[PDB]
């Protein structure tokens, strides 16, 4: 049947079936198997098209949205490989002062965050991580902690 937002796909490189979630942009080999509030951390990479292209990391953010997506993709690879963990990359690289809390946003309900961020967060299971999620703020990786 599959939980909210999951579809079956075929790997372009290997032909093996995998699963993709169009709400969270998550993808995984394994077959996948609502609350008032969720708790999430995030790692935001901002770009020249961000509504406010500035962070505690740098006053003027100049990277292209394409460059921002490559950075996000690289961080996701490191997190999934276990070379680095989410908290460590969030502390170092998130373009939001929540970096100082290892990316933790705290708990929130529907109606509080931008819709793509909200929809991804509510469709993650506890412990699950999103793929790249685009909002007006920039591109996010979202980790649902509660």
């Amino acid at each position: 049947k599959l939980p909210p937002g999951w579809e079956k796909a075929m790997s372009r490189s290997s032909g093996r079936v995998y699963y993709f979630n169009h709400i969270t942009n998550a993808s995984q080999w394994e077959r996948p198997s609502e609350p008032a509030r969720v708790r999430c951390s995030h790692l935001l990479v901002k770009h020249s098209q961000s509504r406010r292209p500035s962070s505690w990391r740098q006053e003027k953010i100049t990277r292209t949205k394409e460059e921002a997506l490559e950075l996000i993709n690289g961080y996701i690879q490191k997190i999934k490989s276990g070379e680095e963990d989410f908290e460590s990359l969030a502390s170092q690289f998130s373009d939001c002062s929540s970096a100082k809390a290892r990316g933790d946003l705290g708990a929130f309900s529907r109606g509080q965050m931008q819709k793509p961020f909200e929809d991804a967060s509510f469709a993650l299971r506890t412990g699950e991580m999103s793929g790249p999620v685009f909002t007006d703020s920039g591109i996010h990786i979202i980790l649902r902690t509660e």
Binding site: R51, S97, S98, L105, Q112, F117
Partner: peptide, 6 residues
């Protein structure tokens, strides 16, 4: 806790 998202 800093204006644009919590």
């Amino acid at each position: 806790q800093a204006s644009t998202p919590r």
